[PDB]
Chain A
Amino acid sequence: FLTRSEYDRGVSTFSPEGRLFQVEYSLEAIKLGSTAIGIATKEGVVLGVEKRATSPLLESDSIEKIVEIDRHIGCAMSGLTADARSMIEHARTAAVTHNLYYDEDINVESLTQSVCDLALRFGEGASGEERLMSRPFGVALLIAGHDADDGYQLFHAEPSGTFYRYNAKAIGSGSEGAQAELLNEWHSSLTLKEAELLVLKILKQVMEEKLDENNAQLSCITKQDGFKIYDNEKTAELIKELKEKEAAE
Chain B
Amino acid sequence: GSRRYDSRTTIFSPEGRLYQVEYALESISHAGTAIGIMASDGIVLAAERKVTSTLLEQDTSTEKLYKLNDKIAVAVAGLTADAEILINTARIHAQNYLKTYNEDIPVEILVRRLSDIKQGYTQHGGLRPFGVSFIYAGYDDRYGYQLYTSNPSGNYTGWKAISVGANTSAAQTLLQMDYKDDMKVDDAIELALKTLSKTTDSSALTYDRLEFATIRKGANDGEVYQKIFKPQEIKDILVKTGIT
**What mask results when residues 163 to 191 of chain A are scored 1 for a CB within 8 Å of chain B, else 0?**
00000000000000000000000000000
Q: How far is the CB of B168 from chain A (nearest CB, A)?
A: 39
Residue positions of B touching A, CB distance < 8 A: 3-4
Residue positions of A touching B, CB distance < 8 A: 9-10, 124
> CA of A9 to CA of B3 in the docked complex: distance in angstroms?
8
In this complex, what residue of B is CB-closest to A124? Answer: B3
- Would you list 4 pairs from A and B whose C-beta atoms are within 8 A, ordered by A residue? A9-B3, A9-B4, A10-B3, A124-B3
Across-interface contacts of A10 in B (CB, < 8 A): 3
Q: How far is the CB of A192 from chain B (nearest CB, A)?
A: 50
Across-interface contacts of B4 in A (CB, < 8 A): 9
Q: How far is the CB of B4 from chain A (nearest CB, A)?
A: 8
> CA of A10 to CA of B3 in the docked complex: distance in angstroms?
8
In this complex, what residue of A is CB-closest to B2? Answer: A124
> CA of A124 to CA of B2 in the docked complex: distance in angstroms?
12
Q: How many A-B residue pairs have CB under 8 A?
A: 4
Q: How far is the CB of A231 from chain B (nearest CB, A)?
A: 41
Across-interface contacts of A9 in B (CB, < 8 A): 3-4
Across-interface contacts of B3 in A (CB, < 8 A): 9-10, 124
Interface of A: prevailing SS: loop
In this complex, what residue of A is CB-closest to B6? Answer: A9
> CA of A124 to CA of B3 in the docked complex: distance in angstroms?
10
In this complex, what residue of A is CB-closest to B3? Answer: A9
In this complex, what residue of A is CB-closest to B4? Answer: A9
In this complex, what residue of B is CB-closest to A9? Answer: B3
> CA of A10 to CA of B4 in the docked complex: distance in angstroms?
9
Q: How far is the CB of A9 from chain B (nearest CB, A)?
A: 7
Across-interface contacts of A124 in B (CB, < 8 A): 3
> CA of A57 to CA of B153 in the docked complex: distance in angstroms?
35
> CA of A20 to CA of B3 in the docked complex: distance in angstroms?
18
Q: How far is the CB of A2 from chain B (nearest CB, A)?
A: 13
Q: How far is the CB of A220 from chain B (nearest CB, A)?
A: 43
Q: How far is the CB of B126 from chain A (nearest CB, A)?
A: 14
List of 3 A-B pairs having minimum Cβ-Cβ separation, nearest first = A9-B3, A124-B3, A10-B3
Q: How far is the CB of B7 from chain A (nearest CB, A)?
A: 13
> CA of A112 to CA of B195 in the docked complex: distance in angstroms?
71
In this complex, what residue of B is CB-closest to A10? Answer: B3
> CA of A124 to CA of B4 in the docked complex: distance in angstroms?
13
Q: How far is the CB of B6 from chain A (nearest CB, A)?
A: 10
Q: How far is the CB of A209 from chain B (nearest CB, A)?
A: 31
> CA of A9 to CA of B4 in the docked complex: distance in angstroms?
8
Q: How far is the CB of A14 from chain B (nearest CB, A)?
A: 16
> CA of A11 to CA of B4 in the docked complex: distance in angstroms?
13
Q: How far is the CB of B14 from chain A (nearest CB, A)?
A: 13
> CA of A33 to CA of B23 in the docked complex: distance in angstroms?
40
Q: How far is the CB of A8 from chain B (nearest CB, A)?
A: 12
Q: How far is the CB of A139 from chain B (nearest CB, A)?
A: 23
Q: How far is the CB of B150 from chain A (nearest CB, A)?
A: 32
Q: How far is the CB of A122 from chain B (nearest CB, A)?
A: 14
Q: How far is the CB of A24 from chain B (nearest CB, A)?
A: 21
Q: How far is the CB of B5 from chain A (nearest CB, A)?
A: 11
> CA of A187 to CA of B4 in the docked complex: distance in angstroms?
54
